[PDB]
Design a protein that fits this description.
monomer; alpha+beta; Kinesin; three-stranded antiparallel sheet; 8 helices; 18 strands; 27% helix; 29% strand; globular; binds adenosine-5'-diphosphate; Kinesin-like protein KIF1A; transport protein; kinesin
């Protein structure tokens, strides 16, 4: 199953408006076109993706791509696979301030909530709508940050241990002693999500906002138990959902995981060895990038002329990822 890829351009932001930036991005169907502001004499480069989301204007536009479309397209599709019994993964990629957090977390208001909130909500809604008493559920969550190769429990900032990433001799990679909490309602999960968001590492270089060098991985362990009065054995289906918000693509080493992710994606796109263990990110996400899992990428794009190089680079790496195929 191919890694599905979407790209999304946001409206100008303060930095761009202050330099009178023009828009160098265009979309139509599933195709995204980028113009080169420095060399207007060349022909615009175009890429095609599963989805090319135009969110450059405002929800008052008939053509604005809303947090709801985005989720109903890729988010919903993955949740359904999770229910099928498939592990899934969605990660946001892009230059700092491109729109990664907004797309993944968004803002809890004006129906401005991103993929994570909507998926969690959608998930409990479905669970509570079950009418077959032979089915019972379990939902566990974990939330971590990876900053400079260091892993931190975001749901338990009451422990400074930089959790160690271990390779289980038989079951794969796992963060040692990372808290896994049972949640029985959307409100509860959303509270953990909220506290977790504040625990994230900040940086003075970012005006003390969340460091553009931290990766956040939100995981859900969805267990389905199906019982039937007969032989009396309850069968179990366990799906792991990984929702990832990555550090800026160009915003014990600072950029190891991101550079390594790039190599792993290129390698995988070419292949169809891979340096998974070269970084904690690619190591933990090994099975989501080539392994047994349905996966998707959402690449955030700045629409500004001043970010051409970084945006072209994001489009290129997104184009690559489109060629990856996992073995599920
Ligand atoms: N689709 C969108 N609709 C509206 N505003 C957006 C959209 N994408 C990005 N933005 C705006 O851009 C800013 C930066 O996106 P953000 O998610 O914070 O950055 P990053 O990619 O570094 O995580 C936000 O403060 C938000 O107001």
């Amino acid at each position: 199953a191919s890694v599905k890829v979407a790209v999304r351009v946001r409206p100008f932001n303060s930095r761009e408006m202050s330099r009178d930036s023009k828009c160098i991005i265009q979309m139509s169907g599933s195709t995204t076109t980028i113009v080169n502001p420095k060399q207007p004499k060349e022909t615009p480069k175009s890429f095609s993706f599963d989805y090319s989301y135009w969110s450059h204007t405002s929800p008052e536009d008939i053509n604005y791509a809303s947090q709801k479309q985005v989720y109903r397209d890729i988010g919903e599709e993955m949740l359904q696979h999770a229910f099928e019994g498939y592990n899934v993964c969605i990660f946001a990629y892009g230059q700092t301030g491109a729109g990664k957090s907004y797309t993944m977390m968004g803002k809890q208001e004006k129906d401005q909530q991103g993929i994570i909130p909507q998926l969690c909500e959608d998930l409990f809604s479905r669970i509570n709508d079950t009418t077959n008493d032979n089915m019972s559920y379990s939902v566990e969550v974990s939330y971590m940050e990876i900053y400079c190769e260091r892993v931190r429990d975001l749901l338990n900032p009451k422990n400074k241990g930089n959790l160690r990433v271990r390779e289980h001799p038989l079951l794969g990679p796992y963060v040692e002693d990372l808290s896994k909490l049972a949640v029985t309602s959307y409100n509860d999960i959303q509270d953990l999500m909220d506290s977790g968001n504040k625990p994230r590492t900040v940086a003075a270089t970012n005006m003390n906002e969340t460091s553009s060098r931290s990766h956040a991985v939100f995981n859900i362990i969805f267990t389905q138990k199906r019982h039937d009065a007969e032989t009396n054995i309850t069968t179990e289906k366990v799906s792991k959902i990984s929702l990832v918000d990555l550090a800026g693509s160009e915003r014990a080493n600072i950029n190891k995981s991101l550079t390594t992710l790039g190599k792993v994606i290129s390698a995988l796109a070419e292949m169809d060895f891979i340096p998974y263990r070269d970084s904690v990110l690619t190591w933990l996400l090994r099975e989501n990038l080539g392994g047994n899992s349905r996966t998707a990428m959402v690449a955030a794009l700045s629409p500004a002329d001043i970010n051409y190089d970084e945006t072209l680079s994001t489009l290129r790496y997104a184009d690559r990822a489109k060629q990856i195929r996992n073995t599920v």
